[PDB]
């Protein structure tokens, strides 16, 4: 699992943590560097948790289709990193699982590959790499969970519940606009049925 | 057994992105070398790039036509130069304690992964030379 | 609690230890208890009782 | 903080720290020493939830056609405690646990000349679970931890909502991984589609 | 009734008791051996009670069909043990009851048998021998009954009620997956009707 | 003193002593050595009867295809038992465990001679019936 | 490097220590003759300085032992620094804690390379030794 607190802070990550701190009324911090601020450290942990959770759900922008994972030539092992939020097959039923930190073919009962495998993969990205609407949803969900766990204010709980639903709605609008999905000619099955 | 600090991938002449599975503390600790007739080490900003923290993007595609069958990604953590040095006046911080612990772990782990630089047993019951010559064997009988 | 300047001849090079004598430190002997030696820089070495 | 580092953190310690964070407590730096009740309680609930969710049965964790070899002398197949589910590949199952050994209830025998073929769920580590499943395990473990070792009822309603969402995303993962089709992937309808 | 206190403690039974203890917030015990811990002794008693109760309900994995119970050659008595959670006939109406700790044919009004009888029987099994899903349901039901009797916390009551319902559902999913029942060709009556 | 040691396998024996110190049970790796190498699982194939011994649930031997068992310590380098968190009390136990865990990896780093060719009495390189590849 | 050898037929006792050591018990001195002789410290060699060892007696090629080996063997089980709560955390103690593991790692970089290693050309440099018992 990637360490959230071991790299330099970005401006957006500084903004996100302070937004989470604001949810319970904590004043903003100038830096995420260790100042013994338990609240800021807790907020960053929840920010990382929510960042991993929403990305792992799967969206057109972050789902990578047709990605090749190359094996080591001498060990024939493909690493299944903890930053692989989702690893699927390109079509049909998926055959690859995680076994000991390496890719395992459950149908062939083998973890040895002579060549790269093509998978539909979600790889963890920085919160800085998220779209603006997705950043807002991550912060809103992190703020809601932060208040529930470390303050518990029931009035704050209700408003952040509504804010997250609105934040998730606008992320769904982004995903549909980004996807540009068509059930007539963008459809795997129906587009073939349209040929005359 | 299986080396986690040295990753080598087949070079097909058209793929320029290679994954970094192992942890590292600095981008200079990652060493990119092309293996083939010779072992050519690449430069940080003219021969490749860190596209992401886990991906190395080669500027040019290399393959058997160029004389390089494989590309190797290897962590080489500094042993003489430590990233964290504590002073009698400094505030003790979690990040400094983490980096000091992790750097020693990488040095220890790189030492435990030296079957790459020798002849060691691979996943199978075979001693692996890992694509280099056993020079100076000379006469045999 | 006592302040003690370690005298010459206490250090033995074949063992690399500076051994101080408790009766020399206090003028007295002791029966029970852990002993802590505090260096001026803050180094603490604790001696369990034989 | 200097340098563009790329380092990982142990997921079990992160999972435990998520469970303690759920009830509002500071994270721990370590999970050994056997003197921390919170570490012992949260880690035990994490294992119990991880064990329980895996036992439910998913396409990624139900291993089909696995052979369990008997002992050459005793002809006994050990029924492991880490066998969350053991079934036949098809039809009605015939194997049960009898004294820690696989027992054929129809033939009334513990003895097997050759290996049996079963549909088995074998317990995996929390590290080997998909990211959505890890979130559901942590969310469910946090909810059970609050009910057992915190008891705040407003936390219960929050974590009940989170587990329901956490299970929903794991149900989405199961269908995407499963890729199930009732026309040609179906065991029975696929035969009916032949012209 | 089989004694639950008088054998070696197994890892699963010890884990089960500590799970039951956790339901009211009690810390785990290292051993089930007598340390004057009234809570652990109470938990183990409810654990055994729930273990007997769920097994006696009847499931494909624990219902033994066609079992022969043999009589004593010199007394012609077949013992009806207290570990026989259920004893039925293989088909039709059952004719055997418990009378004085021995099998009694109520239709023939005799307890003497010259040969073994064939019965559909449920025999008590160790909590170890239960499937993982059934072990979870026993623990969940024991935890709920433990809290009801010895703590009585209403918030704990509501959650454990929901957990038991989920635990029983997952045992019902195990029952059908294990059972593999078919109404067309696995049916006693319809399968005969399918012949052309 | 050795972090890797091998016991010959007979159908009679099931208990094997662990001489080395391990921080976690998952750091101990049990493998069956024969014509094929097989790693065993913590509960289905063996267990920890005590802290210093491992008991197999199944007896193994030449009939099964494995003549030796190997008990190896593999301390995790990626998954550290200690991660210092900001705003947490700095405990000496955390500092000691962080030092021991990295020491264990370095201790196994000087036991690769077993997984290497080795040198003969004559001073040659002895491949113990192993092919050299690549 | 953690291993170095000196062969001195003439009357000489002093051998400079190339590697850094944390404890005197880490430096082990052996005599490479027909069979290796492990020498105790008090009887055979004194630390005239932290850098140099004055080995008592000539121990020259007049005896079979000829060259003298200075090997560093850091103890994994024994830790020179053990952190205790209630004790001042010293920057020296924090620094030396990492060093002891690094020294063990350094000693491992040489033990594996001893039997067979890789030269500067990126090839496995054999010492002129036949690959016996090799299987086809």
mmCIF file of N, CA, C and O in Angstrom, chain F residues 21 90-93 95-96 99-100 102-104 106-107 109-110 112-113 116-120 123-132, chain G residues 73-77 79 81-85 89 94 96-97 100-101 104-105 107-108 111-112 115-116 129-136:
data_model
loop_
_atom_site.group_PDB
_atom_site.id
_atom_site.type_symbol
_atom_site.label_atom_id
_atom_site.label_comp_id
_atom_site.label_asym_id
_atom_site.label_seq_id
_atom_site.Cartn_x
_atom_site.Cartn_y
_atom_site.Cartn_z
ATOM 1 N N UNK F 21 15.564 -16.902 15.370
ATOM 2 C CA UNK F 21 14.573 -15.985 15.914
ATOM 3 C C UNK F 21 13.805 -15.341 14.771
ATOM 4 O O UNK F 21 14.408 -14.806 13.836
ATOM 5 N N UNK F 90 6.802 8.408 20.698
ATOM 6 C CA UNK F 90 7.960 7.643 20.256
ATOM 7 C C UNK F 90 8.376 6.650 21.332
ATOM 8 O O UNK F 90 8.941 7.035 22.358
ATOM 9 N N UNK F 91 8.117 5.371 21.087
ATOM 10 C CA UNK F 91 8.403 4.318 22.048
ATOM 11 C C UNK F 91 9.680 3.591 21.657
ATOM 12 O O UNK F 91 9.924 3.335 20.474
ATOM 13 N N UNK F 92 10.495 3.271 22.665
ATOM 14 C CA UNK F 92 11.753 2.574 22.419
ATOM 15 C C UNK F 92 11.526 1.189 21.835
ATOM 16 O O UNK F 92 12.404 0.655 21.149
ATOM 17 N N UNK F 93 10.369 0.584 22.106
ATOM 18 C CA UNK F 93 10.054 -0.705 21.502
ATOM 19 C C UNK F 93 9.945 -0.586 19.988
ATOM 20 O O UNK F 93 10.398 -1.466 19.249
ATOM 21 N N UNK F 95 11.493 1.620 18.075
ATOM 22 C CA UNK F 95 12.834 1.810 17.536
ATOM 23 C C UNK F 95 13.615 0.504 17.525
ATOM 24 O O UNK F 95 14.392 0.243 16.600
ATOM 25 N N UNK F 96 13.436 -0.324 18.555
ATOM 26 C CA UNK F 96 14.165 -1.586 18.617
ATOM 27 C C UNK F 96 13.656 -2.574 17.576
ATOM 28 O O UNK F 96 14.450 -3.276 16.940
ATOM 29 N N UNK F 99 14.922 -1.734 14.207
ATOM 30 C CA UNK F 99 16.325 -2.105 14.063
ATOM 31 C C UNK F 99 16.489 -3.613 13.914
ATOM 32 O O UNK F 99 17.359 -4.080 13.169
ATOM 33 N N UNK F 100 15.675 -4.394 14.626
ATOM 34 C CA UNK F 100 15.786 -5.847 14.550
ATOM 35 C C UNK F 100 15.300 -6.359 13.201
ATOM 36 O O UNK F 100 15.901 -7.266 12.614
ATOM 37 N N UNK F 102 15.237 -4.914 10.195
ATOM 38 C CA UNK F 102 16.215 -4.689 9.138
ATOM 39 C C UNK F 102 17.468 -5.524 9.370
ATOM 40 O O UNK F 102 18.137 -5.933 8.414
ATOM 41 N N UNK F 103 17.795 -5.802 10.636
ATOM 42 C CA UNK F 103 18.906 -6.697 10.938
ATOM 43 C C UNK F 103 18.615 -8.118 10.477
ATOM 44 O O UNK F 103 19.510 -8.815 9.985
ATOM 45 N N UNK F 104 17.372 -8.572 10.642
ATOM 46 C CA UNK F 104 17.016 -9.918 10.207
ATOM 47 C C UNK F 104 17.171 -10.071 8.701
ATOM 48 O O UNK F 104 17.651 -11.105 8.225
ATOM 49 N N UNK F 106 19.266 -8.358 6.857
ATOM 50 C CA UNK F 106 20.709 -8.394 6.646
ATOM 51 C C UNK F 106 21.306 -9.707 7.136
ATOM 52 O O UNK F 106 22.297 -10.194 6.579
ATOM 53 N N UNK F 107 20.727 -10.289 8.188
ATOM 54 C CA UNK F 107 21.182 -11.596 8.647
ATOM 55 C C UNK F 107 20.929 -12.669 7.596
ATOM 56 O O UNK F 107 21.781 -13.534 7.367
ATOM 57 N N UNK F 109 20.791 -11.930 4.535
ATOM 58 C CA UNK F 109 21.615 -11.509 3.407
ATOM 59 C C UNK F 109 22.965 -12.215 3.395
ATOM 60 O O UNK F 109 23.585 -12.343 2.334
ATOM 61 N N UNK F 110 23.448 -12.645 4.554
ATOM 62 C CA UNK F 110 24.701 -13.383 4.625
ATOM 63 C C UNK F 110 24.497 -14.893 4.695
ATOM 64 O O UNK F 110 25.431 -15.613 5.060
ATOM 65 N N UNK F 112 23.044 -16.438 1.827
ATOM 66 C CA UNK F 112 22.828 -16.820 0.435
ATOM 67 C C UNK F 112 23.823 -17.861 -0.057
ATOM 68 O O UNK F 112 23.681 -18.340 -1.187
ATOM 69 N N UNK F 113 24.828 -18.210 0.750
ATOM 70 C CA UNK F 113 25.771 -19.248 0.345
ATOM 71 C C UNK F 113 25.062 -20.576 0.095
ATOM 72 O O UNK F 113 25.487 -21.357 -0.763
ATOM 73 N N UNK F 116 23.664 -20.648 -3.434
ATOM 74 C CA UNK F 116 24.717 -20.355 -4.391
ATOM 75 C C UNK F 116 25.441 -21.659 -4.715
ATOM 76 O O UNK F 116 25.153 -22.708 -4.135
ATOM 77 N N UNK F 117 26.379 -21.595 -5.664
ATOM 78 C CA UNK F 117 27.080 -22.798 -6.106
ATOM 79 C C UNK F 117 27.825 -23.446 -4.946
ATOM 80 O O UNK F 117 27.686 -24.648 -4.686
ATOM 81 N N UNK F 118 28.620 -22.662 -4.230
ATOM 82 C CA UNK F 118 29.516 -23.201 -3.230
ATOM 83 C C UNK F 118 30.845 -23.633 -3.827
ATOM 84 O O UNK F 118 30.995 -23.810 -5.035
ATOM 85 N N UNK F 119 31.829 -23.808 -2.949
ATOM 86 C CA UNK F 119 33.188 -24.151 -3.350
ATOM 87 C C UNK F 119 33.541 -25.516 -2.777
ATOM 88 O O UNK F 119 33.086 -25.883 -1.688
ATOM 89 N N UNK F 120 34.334 -26.276 -3.529
ATOM 90 C CA UNK F 120 34.737 -27.609 -3.115
ATOM 91 C C UNK F 120 35.944 -27.549 -2.181
ATOM 92 O O UNK F 120 36.507 -26.487 -1.901
ATOM 93 N N UNK F 123 38.656 -26.507 -4.272
ATOM 94 C CA UNK F 123 38.555 -25.128 -4.698
ATOM 95 C C UNK F 123 37.825 -24.911 -6.003
ATOM 96 O O UNK F 123 37.969 -23.841 -6.603
ATOM 97 N N UNK F 124 37.057 -25.893 -6.469
ATOM 98 C CA UNK F 124 36.289 -25.742 -7.693
ATOM 99 C C UNK F 124 34.889 -25.216 -7.375
ATOM 100 O O UNK F 124 34.539 -24.952 -6.222
ATOM 101 N N UNK F 125 34.073 -25.064 -8.415
ATOM 102 C CA UNK F 125 32.694 -24.606 -8.286
ATOM 103 C C UNK F 125 31.780 -25.812 -8.471
ATOM 104 O O UNK F 125 31.735 -26.403 -9.555
ATOM 105 N N UNK F 126 31.053 -26.171 -7.417
ATOM 106 C CA UNK F 126 30.276 -27.409 -7.386
ATOM 107 C C UNK F 126 28.806 -27.100 -7.631
ATOM 108 O O UNK F 126 28.089 -26.675 -6.721
ATOM 109 N N UNK F 127 28.349 -27.325 -8.858
ATOM 110 C CA UNK F 127 26.922 -27.302 -9.151
ATOM 111 C C UNK F 127 26.325 -28.640 -8.739
ATOM 112 O O UNK F 127 26.596 -29.665 -9.374
ATOM 113 N N UNK F 128 25.511 -28.634 -7.684
ATOM 114 C CA UNK F 128 25.026 -29.874 -7.073
ATOM 115 C C UNK F 128 23.977 -30.515 -7.982
ATOM 116 O O UNK F 128 22.779 -30.550 -7.693
ATOM 117 N N UNK F 129 24.460 -31.040 -9.104
ATOM 118 C CA UNK F 129 23.576 -31.637 -10.092
ATOM 119 C C UNK F 129 22.571 -30.659 -10.657
ATOM 120 O O UNK F 129 21.421 -31.032 -10.918
ATOM 121 N N UNK F 130 22.980 -29.410 -10.847
ATOM 122 C CA UNK F 130 22.103 -28.348 -11.312
ATOM 123 C C UNK F 130 22.610 -27.812 -12.642
ATOM 124 O O UNK F 130 23.804 -27.538 -12.796
ATOM 125 N N UNK F 131 21.700 -27.671 -13.600
ATOM 126 C CA UNK F 131 22.050 -27.059 -14.869
ATOM 127 C C UNK F 131 22.276 -25.560 -14.691
ATOM 128 O O UNK F 131 21.653 -24.904 -13.853
ATOM 129 N N UNK F 132 23.185 -25.018 -15.497
ATOM 130 C CA UNK F 132 23.436 -23.584 -15.554
ATOM 131 C C UNK F 132 22.759 -23.044 -16.803
ATOM 132 O O UNK F 132 23.007 -23.530 -17.912
ATOM 133 N N UNK G 73 33.234 -9.351 11.160
ATOM 134 C CA UNK G 73 32.030 -10.146 11.364
ATOM 135 C C UNK G 73 31.164 -9.468 12.416
ATOM 136 O O UNK G 73 31.327 -9.705 13.618
ATOM 137 N N UNK G 74 30.244 -8.618 11.971
ATOM 138 C CA UNK G 74 29.344 -7.939 12.889
ATOM 139 C C UNK G 74 28.283 -8.905 13.405
ATOM 140 O O UNK G 74 27.717 -9.704 12.654
ATOM 141 N N UNK G 75 28.019 -8.830 14.705
ATOM 142 C CA UNK G 75 27.069 -9.724 15.352
ATOM 143 C C UNK G 75 25.646 -9.247 15.097
ATOM 144 O O UNK G 75 25.300 -8.105 15.413
ATOM 145 N N UNK G 76 24.830 -10.124 14.515
ATOM 146 C CA UNK G 76 23.425 -9.799 14.300
ATOM 147 C C UNK G 76 22.638 -9.870 15.603
ATOM 148 O O UNK G 76 21.801 -9.004 15.884
ATOM 149 N N UNK G 77 22.893 -10.903 16.411
ATOM 150 C CA UNK G 77 22.131 -11.092 17.641
ATOM 151 C C UNK G 77 22.381 -9.961 18.632
ATOM 152 O O UNK G 77 21.442 -9.455 19.257
ATOM 153 N N UNK G 79 23.135 -6.210 19.671
ATOM 154 C CA UNK G 79 22.959 -4.849 19.187
ATOM 155 C C UNK G 79 23.721 -3.900 20.100
ATOM 156 O O UNK G 79 23.489 -3.884 21.313
ATOM 157 N N UNK G 81 23.466 -0.771 20.290
ATOM 158 C CA UNK G 81 22.522 0.202 20.819
ATOM 159 C C UNK G 81 21.186 -0.497 21.031
ATOM 160 O O UNK G 81 20.679 -1.181 20.134
ATOM 161 N N UNK G 82 20.653 -0.374 22.240
ATOM 162 C CA UNK G 82 19.316 -0.839 22.575
ATOM 163 C C UNK G 82 18.557 0.338 23.167
ATOM 164 O O UNK G 82 18.916 0.833 24.242
ATOM 165 N N UNK G 83 17.522 0.786 22.469
ATOM 166 C CA UNK G 83 16.767 1.948 22.911
ATOM 167 C C UNK G 83 15.936 1.596 24.136
ATOM 168 O O UNK G 83 15.255 0.567 24.164
ATOM 169 N N UNK G 84 16.004 2.451 25.152
ATOM 170 C CA UNK G 84 15.263 2.264 26.386
ATOM 171 C C UNK G 84 14.457 3.522 26.676
ATOM 172 O O UNK G 84 14.961 4.640 26.553
ATOM 173 N N UNK G 85 13.195 3.327 27.043
ATOM 174 C CA UNK G 85 12.327 4.447 27.376
ATOM 175 C C UNK G 85 12.784 5.076 28.683
ATOM 176 O O UNK G 85 13.098 4.370 29.646
ATOM 177 N N UNK G 89 17.194 10.186 23.982
ATOM 178 C CA UNK G 89 17.489 9.745 22.632
ATOM 179 C C UNK G 89 18.613 10.589 22.045
ATOM 180 O O UNK G 89 18.493 11.804 21.872
ATOM 181 N N UNK G 94 20.908 6.994 17.496
ATOM 182 C CA UNK G 94 20.051 6.810 16.331
ATOM 183 C C UNK G 94 20.881 6.529 15.087
ATOM 184 O O UNK G 94 20.511 5.698 14.250
ATOM 185 N N UNK G 96 24.021 5.234 14.943
ATOM 186 C CA UNK G 96 24.780 3.987 14.998
ATOM 187 C C UNK G 96 23.844 2.788 14.894
ATOM 188 O O UNK G 96 24.267 1.677 14.553
ATOM 189 N N UNK G 97 22.556 2.994 15.178
ATOM 190 C CA UNK G 97 21.590 1.904 15.074
ATOM 191 C C UNK G 97 21.470 1.414 13.638
ATOM 192 O O UNK G 97 21.414 0.206 13.383
ATOM 193 N N UNK G 100 24.957 -0.525 12.219
ATOM 194 C CA UNK G 100 25.247 -1.921 12.526
ATOM 195 C C UNK G 100 24.603 -2.859 11.513
ATOM 196 O O UNK G 100 25.216 -3.845 11.093
ATOM 197 N N UNK G 101 23.363 -2.571 11.114
ATOM 198 C CA UNK G 101 22.726 -3.368 10.072
ATOM 199 C C UNK G 101 23.419 -3.176 8.730
ATOM 200 O O UNK G 101 23.580 -4.130 7.962
ATOM 201 N N UNK G 104 26.528 -5.293 8.559
ATOM 202 C CA UNK G 104 26.174 -6.679 8.267
ATOM 203 C C UNK G 104 25.843 -6.838 6.791
ATOM 204 O O UNK G 104 26.234 -7.823 6.153
ATOM 205 N N UNK G 105 25.114 -5.873 6.227
ATOM 206 C CA UNK G 105 24.823 -5.907 4.799
ATOM 207 C C UNK G 105 26.103 -5.830 3.978
ATOM 208 O O UNK G 105 26.256 -6.557 2.992
ATOM 209 N N UNK G 107 29.072 -6.863 4.867
ATOM 210 C CA UNK G 107 29.739 -8.155 4.980
ATOM 211 C C UNK G 107 29.060 -9.201 4.106
ATOM 212 O O UNK G 107 29.704 -10.153 3.649
ATOM 213 N N UNK G 108 27.756 -9.046 3.867
ATOM 214 C CA UNK G 108 27.052 -9.969 2.985
ATOM 215 C C UNK G 108 27.392 -9.706 1.521
ATOM 216 O O UNK G 108 27.399 -10.635 0.704
ATOM 217 N N UNK G 111 30.612 -11.917 1.155
ATOM 218 C CA UNK G 111 30.533 -13.364 1.329
ATOM 219 C C UNK G 111 29.990 -14.042 0.078
ATOM 220 O O UNK G 111 30.512 -15.075 -0.354
ATOM 221 N N UNK G 112 28.933 -13.481 -0.512
ATOM 222 C CA UNK G 112 28.377 -14.056 -1.733
ATOM 223 C C UNK G 112 29.326 -13.876 -2.909
ATOM 224 O O UNK G 112 29.484 -14.785 -3.732
ATOM 225 N N UNK G 115 32.731 -16.639 -3.429
ATOM 226 C CA UNK G 115 32.781 -17.881 -4.195
ATOM 227 C C UNK G 115 32.752 -17.608 -5.696
ATOM 228 O O UNK G 115 33.482 -18.244 -6.464
ATOM 229 N N UNK G 116 31.921 -16.661 -6.131
ATOM 230 C CA UNK G 116 31.868 -16.237 -7.524
ATOM 231 C C UNK G 116 31.166 -14.889 -7.572
ATOM 232 O O UNK G 116 30.148 -14.675 -6.910
ATOM 233 N N UNK G 129 38.383 -21.800 -12.236
ATOM 234 C CA UNK G 129 37.925 -22.999 -11.550
ATOM 235 C C UNK G 129 36.904 -23.720 -12.415
ATOM 236 O O UNK G 129 35.970 -23.098 -12.932
ATOM 237 N N UNK G 130 37.084 -25.029 -12.568
ATOM 238 C CA UNK G 130 36.197 -25.815 -13.412
ATOM 239 C C UNK G 130 34.833 -25.992 -12.754
ATOM 240 O O UNK G 130 34.723 -26.085 -11.527
ATOM 241 N N UNK G 131 33.791 -26.042 -13.580
ATOM 242 C CA UNK G 131 32.419 -26.220 -13.101
ATOM 243 C C UNK G 131 32.189 -27.727 -13.023
ATOM 244 O O UNK G 131 31.784 -28.369 -13.993
ATOM 245 N N UNK G 132 32.453 -28.299 -11.856
ATOM 246 C CA UNK G 132 32.339 -29.741 -11.682
ATOM 247 C C UNK G 132 30.928 -30.094 -11.238
ATOM 248 O O UNK G 132 30.173 -29.246 -10.746
ATOM 249 N N UNK G 133 30.565 -31.364 -11.421
ATOM 250 C CA UNK G 133 29.255 -31.921 -11.096
ATOM 251 C C UNK G 133 28.122 -31.247 -11.858
ATOM 252 O O UNK G 133 26.951 -31.440 -11.511
ATOM 253 N N UNK G 134 28.436 -30.471 -12.893
ATOM 254 C CA UNK G 134 27.411 -29.789 -13.669
ATOM 255 C C UNK G 134 26.538 -30.795 -14.408
ATOM 256 O O UNK G 134 27.036 -31.748 -15.015
ATOM 257 N N UNK G 135 25.227 -30.577 -14.358
ATOM 258 C CA UNK G 135 24.261 -31.449 -15.007
ATOM 259 C C UNK G 135 23.831 -30.864 -16.346
ATOM 260 O O UNK G 135 23.595 -29.660 -16.472
ATOM 261 N N UNK G 136 23.737 -31.733 -17.347
ATOM 262 C CA UNK G 136 23.364 -31.316 -18.694
ATOM 263 C C UNK G 136 21.873 -31.006 -18.796
ATOM 264 O O UNK G 136 21.456 -30.172 -19.600
#
